[PDB]
């Protein structure tokens, strides 16, 4: 591809935990994402992992996807 | 620190080194470099920037199971001055401060009178506790338990003595062959 | 019994030599492959170590049997005393964490993995080691074939030398 | 003589176990060692007389040495006879304690009884030549030299740049500075300057060379330390060894315009220079950065004991306008 | 004046030869870094190189070698010896005719001195640790131990027997980097081979493959003085003059055909 | 007797907290499976089927069960709160105040971050909490 | 839903494997606790699993290597016993001939 | 005899002193090869264990087994030394041992100190030296 392999694009979450809707126009260059939790940044990582055939138990915050 | 008849339930918040408090208490019984978390120099065993690591332990024997109450005093003052250089000084005082002993061998005698670190179940490190409570599956649970029961070490020395018995049998064989040769020459010289 | 033994002996020796030849070929395969593996991994990670301005190496250990082989780390910053092995005994956890950071960096260097994610590992780390992690991300941006990089941090510090190929983010939560 | 010739042989042999550099007093002890091996000892000599014949032998030696493009020089250790002899009698104490197990002879009793007169001199058989076999040291590969030369350059830079701050009393150099100051002036609370410099830093930069693995690095360093080319401070810093110095002394003197002592006019990398920058200013008649005048520690002691407490390049208040040199 | 005049004439021959100086320079460099023997071919090769650079016709090779030997005696009391070939070991000083060459230290003891060196090094080790000098010292020490092994082995001991005796003295045969030396004993062995201290014998028995024994290499053999060996052993056990000749003959037994005497 | 009493004490502690079961102490495999039948569970399933806090409490109860027959009159424990639960810590303090209150022989060096020794019910006779001056 | 086509998780796992991505593997994805576990993982085992994250063909190669080592030990002890047996049988047969 | 702390600890103490005395006979046997030490230590440990009969603390069994191993080696070595009146095998250890002053099975300090010293004192190889001028270029 023109970009590096597996380059992510804007990700749309909907009805997730608290986020009824949201969309992140991600960056192919770099991501120095700095900031603590409070809206579920770890839950955001769990969302990314589970939505891509990844077991949430890699971290272990919440298990059941539903 | 305030203690007495009651156990050492150290309520030590963050910044007091609760695990470090446990390690200092353990070093009260002579821990080594890999069981002290302080390295070759003993400066960090003392307060960082201090020299006189004073371990003062008034041990009163006015209850069940008294050790030398008329000799070591009713109380016993364990005084371990762990310093930056040289071996740590020791003083096993009586109730009135009379230093009955100056070494931890009498502490060992008192403990054996009381059984009050060698066993993993006895003393567990942060890594050991983490392995026991989080990094222990049925096999690892088994290993932790057997070590704590010393059953692992038990069987260790068991088969170690067994191995030396095999060595002993080899000695039996070789030395018996030598005896056979000597007795063969003996009998031939007889005849 | 001797007939049985003397019949089996040539066969047993033949099987032993078949083994030996297989082992020799396995050495000739892995040992150069592992050589490149460890050599270039260590080269990248230690050059990054120096970019930090810190002492750290990763040595491969190959005893007589492959089952005995392993990888160890041996680092140093305190100039007062010479370098020794880096393990989980007495060192600061932040040093080991940065070592793992360089570990995954070299993994990207070698494995097909075309992008990087760091999931808030920097919890409990001090100012210095987290700044080191940030500069590791900078060097990730300083490398060629700019891939996708992600690092999750709770806070940010001052004195962050920046460049153009990079893209600083901010996770909001 | 053949006796003396073989003597000098054995001397050089020790020198090889001394790997090329030997103490004045250690040489003396070897002398007594040899005279016990020779049983020719005549008790009636002051240590000076032994020194005399020692040096006579030395001259015969260096006669031939000069025939050989190699040579022994006697110098005085820059840390000075007193500090040298302090550390050396810390081990002469360990020595007489170890020899009491062997002090079954009156010779050994005399040896332990002869308190060593304080002396910082060493003798060094050193190359005088640069040709094929010379570069054919065969010690190790080329990178090791180039990088070590680089580190030497780093130490040169370190020495040149003066660092200001409290003196490291951890350095015994400062201790003996103050001791000499009290001995000469009697001012027990004389104010110390905060101006000082040294080469020993840069171990951190040993680990800043990037062209080889850290292991190999350390190991080569261990060789050198064993080979006593550089030296380890207990703070972790490294300087370059006195004998190693004499070698590079002359080469670097050529390469960097290195000013020598002022009294003995020998280059010393430790001692006392003038903290007045005007003494360390460039001599404008030359256009060269003129490092501040500095005597050997003994040279400084004799000067102040007999000449002045003011600089000559600048005249400054060397009581206050000095610089400790490490 | 014998030394003075002799060294004077030496200096004269030096006026005819600075080449010898450079030669010993390379000699001692190669050794010190390597502890090395040198081949006749290498000698004459560097000699011809020098003759070209000196731009002087090549004089007698025997001349040259004798001259430098005398040089480093009057300066060093040493003898340059060449070795008889390895082919002469399994099938007048030759000098110019000898093939492999090294330097030998030609003085006797000075007992008190060596012991005092013992004393200094005792301070050393007691202070040392719970190195290259000492590193090689251990290397040589294991060497000497093994030498004694082969001597009780009558100049013949197999590989594995040696391995067991190494384990006998707590030597980790696991294949780890050697304590202090950070290498494998195998590499030590290969050194003694290249340093000609040992002989490795490999024979293809059709039942057990290649069986390997070992014998004493001529570096040690030329090194190994008889009286040196004997008084060495006396000093091993702190012995008096009583068992002198008795253990002397016991050592003769331990030798047997150990040397191509 | 140690395995027997360890299983018995494990069951007793679980009943005090609520539970029962067996220990598959396979020496040959050197694996200590802990098949505990719990009210929170269905059958004599392994403790791995329990919750993380439940598994931590089960491990703690098994460890105290191990302590029970051993000839040790001294035990220590530190750095466990980080990978456990405060409910488990409180239940352990209750177990100490109900067992170590009469165990005047074993010296328990147990280290906790919070001042749970005097906040919770762990002080009693025999051996129990004593004042540690918080920083 | 691959391109908004509903499927199970197996196809997405195949995609993750084919994308050079492993959200599970620590070499590509781990946490701080996993980082410290890595800091305590067996150097042998940890190195092996990293290699697996790179190559597993050589992993099985090594496994067969150790297996062949075990077979070698077994067969070697067998050869030793056979040698001792042969020698003893020869001596005993000599005795039988004498008898 | 089932659980007296005094008996157990005195067994410990006697066994530790026994270990010290057996180390003494270790060097005794290395120089000479006496079997009486082995047999008597065996008898001592067995008698103490007989007192430990009924007492059931693991550490005592472990240390007793240590004693067992040591005594068995003692006896085997002494028998080997008894069979005939090897010597180098005795000597090299003694060489190592006599280079073992210590305060009174890893590799000692003066072990290698003595050995290397000996070789130097005796090597017919002359010592060597090196330098840097010319590699200094
Ligand atoms: Zn001036």
Residue numbers in the entry:
A (entry chain A): 35 to 100
B (entry chain B): 98 to 213, 215 to 289
C (entry chain A): 896 to 1068
D (entry chain D): 11 to 336
E (entry chain E): 9 to 99, 114 to 152, 173 to 303
F (entry chain B): 970 to 1104
G (entry chain A): 151 to 249
H (entry chain F): 40 to 124, 184 to 202, 213 to 245
Published text:
The Smc5/6 complex has roles in the processes of DNA replication and DNA damage repair; the complex acting to suppress / prevent formation of inappropriate structures that can form during homologous recombination-mediated rescue of replication forks that have stalled (or collapsed) on encountering replication ‘road-blocks’ or obstacles. As well as containing subunits that provide both ubiquitin and SUMO E3-ligase activity (through Nse1 and Nse2 respectively), Smc5/6 is further differentiated from the cohesin and condensin complexes by the fact that the two non-SMC proteins (Nse1 and Nse3) that bind to its kleisin subunit (Nse4) belong to the ‘KITE’ family (kleisin-interacting tandem winged-helix element; 15) rather than the distinct and structurally unrelated ‘HAWK’ family (HEAT proteins associated with kleisins; 16).
Here, we report the cryogenic EM (cryo-EM) structure of the six-subunit budding yeast Smc5/6 holo-complex, reconstituted from recombinant proteins expressed in insect cells – providing both an architectural overview of the entire complex and an understanding of how the Nse1/3/4 subcomplex binds to the hetero-dimeric SMC protein core. Here, we have determined a cryo-EM structure for the budding yeast Smc5/6 ‘holo-complex’, in its apo or non-liganded form. Additional experiments also reveal the presence of a crucial interface formed between the head domain of Smc5 and Nse1, which utilises the equivalent of the ‘W-loop’ or ‘F-loop’ found in Smc4 and Smc1 respectively.
